[PDB]
Predict the structure of Transient receptor potential cation channel subfamily M member 8.
Amino acid sequence: DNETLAWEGVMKENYLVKINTKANDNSEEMRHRFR
Amino acid sequence: DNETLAWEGVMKENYLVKINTKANDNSEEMRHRFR
């Protein structure tokens, strides 16, 4: 029970990280660096 | 036999070069140069 919920929470954190990385993958930050 | 294999190897080298050039054709290196 608790083990399954903790594992699901870990996978949820991974999924959120994946979404954030996909959003940041635009690769426009380089331009900012240039500025 | 050996002639055909050598010719095939030459064409394979050409094909690999073509793939690498297609990959590098992104033309983003200019930005790096600017940096």
About this structure: Helices of chain B lie at 2-24, 29-34. Residues 19 and 31 of chain B are 22 Å apart (CA to CA). The radius of gyration of chain B is 16 Å. Chain B is about 85% helix and 0% strand.
